[PDB]
């Protein structure tokens, strides 16, 4: 029901994937390094409370009547719900507080990719907080209260709600389906594979940025799906686009979802074939994204898609090569990248005295 907050790594990367997501990007408004360090310590104290299911500060009620309550109160009577709070620092943060020479080389700017249609306002950000939990209100309350605590030093730049499976009704190692109706996550780095996480996910001391040892690098892409066009495509077009069948999720020619794929039996521009590590020099990613549906746009169409989150040991050898290989993906006909951001996710909060960002500041 809870997930430990302290560790060598931040939680919410290799830890079990929770049902809901509230992702927020923040911009920093203060120039004062001391004030910003004060805020990181305040935020860490609040995150310790929130992840244990407690209110922030001195609570949501029962304080001085003439003061505003420390906690906004909308999670009172809810459970921790496996809440994890993961912080990351964007490249623009390092233009402040004199940190320019501390930006990791692995925190690379993404190239412009064919077909990008990025909304500037839903892109970038000086920092992020990824809030995952099984209850969406627990996640929202966390973001709402961190934003309130930081008011005057940070503002919210953009915010995204997402959902995965619903655990109260769905088995745990049954693969979720994305909004195109296909199982999503079959060949992924699992949190149980410690050695694959060391090789592909966690930054190492010898990688070149000591303060990032134990951290990771995060790519966020807001990917709209053209739902109504996808839904008019034949069953065979849909399966050809991925290289797996829709019902079982088996690679073409195989019989079970987890059968290892034979890439030559797939069409040359099938998504699985272009994404597979064998097609990308061994490049492998930890995907931890969530579906979204925000409503409908001005033309009656469903504003829905995949809020893609990938964690990797180096942006230049993870996301960049694989996304480059998707230049000709048959899936490109039905999707559009409309928001993008990169963040360096620092190492974990080691104990009760530690704080978010201690190794950098």
Residues 237-256 that bind its own copies (CB under 8 A): 238, 245-247
Residue 180 in tokens:
């195109």
With tokens 């807001």, the residue in question is: 222
- 209 close to 135: Cβ distance less than 8 angstroms: no
> Under the criterion CB under 8 A, does residue 181 sit at the interface with its own copies?
yes
How many residues touch ligand HEM under the rule CB under 6 A: the total is 29
Query: Which residue stretch of 8-16, 90-98, 267-275, 286-294 sits at the interface with its own copies (rule: CB under 8 A)?
Result: 286-294
Strands 84-89 and 20-28: unpaired
Mind spelling out the 3-state secondary structure of 291-349? EEEEEECCCCCEEEEEEEEEEECCHHHCHHHHHHHHHHCHHHHHEEEEEEEEEEECCCC
Nearer to its own copies, 182 or 355 (CB): 182
Of 108, 126, 119, the closest CA to residue 320 belongs to: 108
- Give the Cα-Cα-Cα angle 33, 38, 41 (nearest 5 degrees): 130
> Under the criterion CB under 6 A, does residue 359 sit at the interface with ligand HEM?
no
- CB under 5 to 8 A by kind: which of ligand HEM, its own copies, none does 276 bind? ligand HEM
Q: How far is CA 195 from CA 14, 128, 200, in A?
A: 12, 27, 9
Phi, psi of 346 (to 5 degrees): -70, 170
Nearer to ligand HEM, 156 or 263 (CB): 263
Could you give the CA distance from residue 305 to residue 283 in angstroms, rounded to a whole number? 24
Which listed residue (131, 322, 342, 345) binds ligand HEM by CB under 6 A?
322
Of residues 103-162, those binding its own copies (CB under 8 A)? 121, 134-138, 140, 143-144, 147-148, 155-161
Q: For ligand HEM, what does the binding mask look like between residues 219 and 248, x meaning CB under 6 A?
A: --x-x-x----------------x-x----
- CB under 5 to 8 A by kind: which of ligand HEM, its own copies, none does 231 bind? its own copies
- CB under 5 to 8 A by kind: which of ligand HEM, its own copies, none does 273 bind? none
> Under the criterion CB under 6 A, does residue 180 sit at the interface with ligand HEM?
yes
- 16 close to 164: Cβ distance less than 8 angstroms: no
> Under the criterion CB under 8 A, does residue 30 sit at the interface with its own copies?
no
Nearer to ligand HEM, 14 or 39 (CB): 14
Contacts (Cβ under 8 Å, ≥6 apart) of 144: 72, 74
Q: For ligand HEM, what does the binding mask look like between residues 255 and 274, x meaning CB under 6 A?
A: ------x---------xx--
Contacts to ligand HEM by CB under 6 A? 178, 180, 182-188, 221, 223, 225, 242, 244, 261, 271-272, 275-277, 285, 305-306, 308, 319, 322-323, 326, 335
Binding residues for heme b, as ranges, are 185-187, 271, 287, 308
């Amino acid at each position: 029901s809870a997930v430990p907050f302290h560790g060598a790594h931040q939680a919410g990367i290799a830890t079990p994937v929770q049902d809901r997501l509230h992702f927020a990007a923040f911009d920093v408004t203060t120039e004062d390094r001391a004030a910003f360090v004060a805020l990181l310590k305040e935020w860490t104290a609040a995150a310790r409370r929130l992840t244990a299911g407690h209110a922030v500060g001195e609570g949501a009620y029962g304080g001085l009547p003439e003061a505003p309550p420390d906690d906004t109160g909308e999670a009172l009577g809810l459970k921790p719900s496996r809440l994890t709070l993961t912080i990351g620092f964007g490249p623009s943060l390092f233009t402040r507080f004199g940190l320019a020479d501390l930006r990791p080389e692995a925190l690379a700017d993404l190239p412009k990719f064919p077909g990008d249609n990025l909304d500037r306002a839903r892109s970038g950000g000086d920092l992020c907080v990824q809030a995952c939990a099984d209850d969406p209100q627990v996640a929202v309350h966390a973001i709402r209260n961190l934003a309130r605590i930081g008011f005057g030093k940070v503002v919210v730049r953009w915010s995204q709600l997402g959902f995965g499976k619903t655990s109260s009704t769905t088995p745990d190692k049954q693969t979720p389906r994305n909004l195109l109706g296909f199982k999503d996550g079959t060949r992924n780095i699992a949190g149980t594979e410690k050695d694959r996480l060391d090789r592909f996910v966690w930054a190492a001391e010898k990688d070149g940025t000591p303060w990032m040892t134990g951290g990771s690098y995060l790519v966020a892409r807001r990917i709209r799906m053209h739902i109504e066009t996808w839904d008019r495509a034949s069953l065979q077009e849909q399966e050809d686009v991925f290289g797996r069948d829709k019902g079982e999720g088996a690679p073409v020619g195989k019989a079970k979802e987890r059968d290892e794929p034979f890439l030559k039996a797939m069409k040359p521009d099938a998504h699985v074939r272009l994404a597979h590590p064998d097609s990308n020099g061994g490049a492998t990613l930890l995907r931890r994204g969530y579906s979204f549906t925000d409503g409908t746009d001005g033309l009656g169409r469903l504003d829905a898609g995949l809020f893609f989150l990938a964690y990797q040991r180096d942006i230049r050898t993870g996301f960049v090569p694989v996304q480059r290989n998707l230049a000709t993906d048959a899936l490109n006909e039905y999707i559009q990248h409309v928001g993008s951001a990169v963040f360096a996710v620092p190492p974990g909060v080691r104990d009760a005295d530690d704080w978010w960002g201690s190794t950098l500041f």
